[PDB]
Amino acid sequence: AERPTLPIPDLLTTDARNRIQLTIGAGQSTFGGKTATTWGYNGNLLGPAVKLQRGKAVTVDIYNQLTEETTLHWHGLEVPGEVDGGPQGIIPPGGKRSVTLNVDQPAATCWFHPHQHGKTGRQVAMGLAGLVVIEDDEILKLMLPKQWGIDDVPVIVQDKKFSADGQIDYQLDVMTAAVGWFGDTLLTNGAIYPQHAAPRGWLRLRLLNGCNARSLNFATSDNRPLYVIASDGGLLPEPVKVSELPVLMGERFEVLVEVNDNKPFDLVTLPVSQMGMAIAPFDKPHPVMRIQPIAISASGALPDTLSSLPALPSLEGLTVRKLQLSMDPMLDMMGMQMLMEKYGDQAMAGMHMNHGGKFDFHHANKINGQAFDMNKPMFAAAKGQYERWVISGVGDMMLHPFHIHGTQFRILSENGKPPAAHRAGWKDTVKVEGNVSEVLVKFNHDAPKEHAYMAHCHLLEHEDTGMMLGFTVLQGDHGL
């Protein structure tokens, strides 16, 4: 009769030999009483939270016990291309690869997930995702909620859909290559609508939108506020009070919310203005989890001031790079029609024959006129120098959260508007949807042609059908 408890990922630290072992394997999970094959890191589904410290190096041993290739991308981590885990970071089935992570960035909740060439959406959908908890000396002094799994909890929110036999019903087809893969069942750390018991005072939630294609918008059932304290790349300068919190695919935000005795409440997600994503039961506020107040005092603080955010650097003389996102107009239209025909007018609530490889949807989506080419990086970016990357979605109305590997950047313009205050700090993702975004990005680490960084749409079905470029980083200006 009762809701399951929110599953709490193991917070994983190094041994004396300084290794973290991650095993990628196929297992089973149960959803609405039906069995489904799932994939996980150190288990059947999802994965642990890998805990790292600024200024220390850790080695991660990665064992692929799948029967297919995969890669492991450390989403948000400022690391060299060699260990970034892009699509060149191949781990053969039954094989092992070790990476050393030399951590040199502020405290943050990052994550990790597969980046297999053309199969990233399927591998996430099957269950692969974990967390990264980066700490530093600065953050521990703030005395935030810090009891992992009690008053400091990760909340990985994902949608899936299942076939009649209970298996995950994933497909990369003409429809999902346009609008994304999405489902009717919402999971929270792998569980359907769990409860979490939290002590009286501040509760710290580390929110991850882990959907392939579904954007989310978090809020509380009884309208209590959320206090945003951090973004993808770490703390904000001060808390930002919000009543609602849009989160794009792959983004993280940390929020503090009040817990008081005798008033249970739900974390919910509100209907979003994205094509396909307001079909029942997501036409209305949808529960994510129930917070269950415990009459024991919680010790964590919401400080006035969290961190020091540098002034945006002057724009004069920065290299500008243009990244024009596009979708093939005919495959875009065909995919939108299929959505409309399947679901009707609700698909936009709140807004035949083989003609050969030329019309193949697998390379329909592009950047600068080109579908992703793993054999040819599109440019060499500078090391250790800010650049101004201009990323355009003009030409179609689809949502394109854009992720740049190897960096935490500042948003100058988010889809034609200066960024909201809670999105004005360190980010690894920017919204692009029918308009233009500009970010100020710096790459502190190398990435050669053989292990290039990726810059790509993180609506995963666009990525898999070509909306990605590779770039290198090798040094700074030799000029003047």
Which parts of 393-467 are beta strand (E)? 400-404, 410-413, 429-432, 436-441, 453-457
Please check if 113 is assigned to a binding site: yes
Report d(CA 321, CA 173) in Å as an integer: 31
Q: Which amino acid is at 23?
A: T
- Kind plus residue range of the DSSP H or E element containing 462: helix 460-464
Q: CATH assignment of 136-307?
A: 2.60.40.420
- 396-431 burial: b if 16+ Cβ within 10 Å, else e: bebbbbbbbbbbbbbbbbbbeeebeebbbbbbbbbb
Q: CATH assignment of 1-135?
A: 2.60.40.420
- CATH 2.60.40.420 boundaries in the chain: 1-135, 136-307, 308-480
| Residue 374 region by backbone torsions, left for phi larger than 0, else alpha for psi between -120 and 50, else beta | alpha
Technique employed here was X-ray
CB 129 within 8 A of CB 76: no
Report which of 177, 232, 228 is spatially closest to residue 430, judged by C-alpha positions. Answer: 232
Please check if 73 is assigned to a binding site: yes
Q: Which amino acid is at 231?
A: S
Please check if 115 is assigned to a binding site: yes
Please check if 457 is assigned to a binding site: yes
CA torsion 387→315→403→270, rounded to 10°? 180
Tokens encoding 221 = 């059932």
Report which of 356, 379, 355 is spatially closest to residue 367, judged by C-alpha positions. Answer: 379
Query: Nearest-5° angle of CA 444, CA 445, CA 451?
Result: 145
Listing DSSP states for 172-185 in one string gives -STTHHHH----SE
Listing DSSP states for 227-293 in one string gives EEEEETTEEEEEEEEES-EEE-TT-EEEEEEEE-TT--EEEEE---SSTTTTSTTTTS-EEEEEEEE
CB atoms within 10 A of CB 394: 13
Data resolution in angstroms: 2.0
Report d(CA 265, CA 244) in Å as an integer: 15
**Class for domain 308-480, per CATH?**
mainly beta
Report d(CA 205, CA 156) in Å as an integer: 10
Report d(CA 347, CA 367) in Å as an integer: 26
Task: Label the pairing between strands 11-12 and 49-53.
Answer: parallel
Tokens encoding 229 = 């304290």
Please check if 462 is assigned to a binding site: yes
